[PDB]
Design a protein around this ligand. Structure first.
Ligand SMILES: [Cl-]
Length: 214
């Protein structure tokens, strides 16, 4: 069985909802950090995307951002707050980080070689959940309900949405990535989508992948 589902292993927190704020980069980043918190310490908790929205000046808050900028921030800031200590409000505010609420740390990051789905698979297997960016603009993506998603019109050069690869596997003969979104449990299959794997880097799944070192 060349498959892994980190949701079964306790590496994945409940699905969140970014609301009316283009902060999927922040949810993708905290998801990867949460997975490494479980792996390194044996337990996890919800980390603060609002911490990243307000304090990662290299990104654009609700206007977009990159996950490696977030990992670099957590490293140089010497921590990121828990969700409970720094709760999500769906809009950018002044940076209110407090070391008293520190719940995770970061020693750097690694970017997966661009477009290499085999390297992405090895990273998911050997690290844990990996932050990724995809083209999520298609209507077919947005109304996804079940099965393995593949749409030929997906633009690997148009990465517009950050998500989290929490595993991989195969379903009815179709290889897939298990993808955690940030559009609520209401979206997709309880917040998740299975995206085609080894189909010429569909939707750019392996073009902007990274994970934090802890
Ligand atoms: Cl394979």
């Amino acid at each position: 069985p060349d498959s892994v589902d980190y949701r079964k292993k306790g590496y994945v927190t409940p699905v969140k909802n970014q609301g009316q704020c283009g902060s999927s980069w922040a949810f993708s980043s905290v998801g990867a950090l949460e997975g490494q918190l479980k792996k390194k310490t044996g337990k996890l908790l919800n980390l603060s995307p609002q911490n990243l929205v307000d304090c990662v000046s290299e990104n654009d808050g609700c206007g977009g951002g990159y996950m490696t900028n977030a990992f670099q921030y957590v490293q140089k800031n010497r921590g990121i707050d828990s969700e409970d200590a720094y709760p999500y409000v769906g809009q950018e505010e002044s940076c209110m980080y407090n070391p008293t609420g520190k719940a995770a740390k970061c020693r750097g990051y690694r970017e997966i070689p661009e477009g290499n789905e085999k390297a992405l698979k090895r990273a998911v297997a050997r690290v844990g959940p990996v932050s990724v960016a995809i083209d999520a603009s298609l209507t077919s993506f947005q109304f996804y309900s079940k099965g393995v998603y593949y749409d030929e019109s997906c633009n690997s050069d148009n990465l517009n949405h950050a998500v989290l690869a929490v595993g991989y596997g195969i379903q009815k003969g179709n290889k897939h990535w298990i993808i955690k979104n940030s559009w609520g449990e209401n979206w997709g299959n309880k917040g998740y989508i299975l995206m085609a794997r080894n189909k010429n880097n569909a939707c750019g799944i392996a073009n902007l992948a990274s994970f934090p070192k802890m």
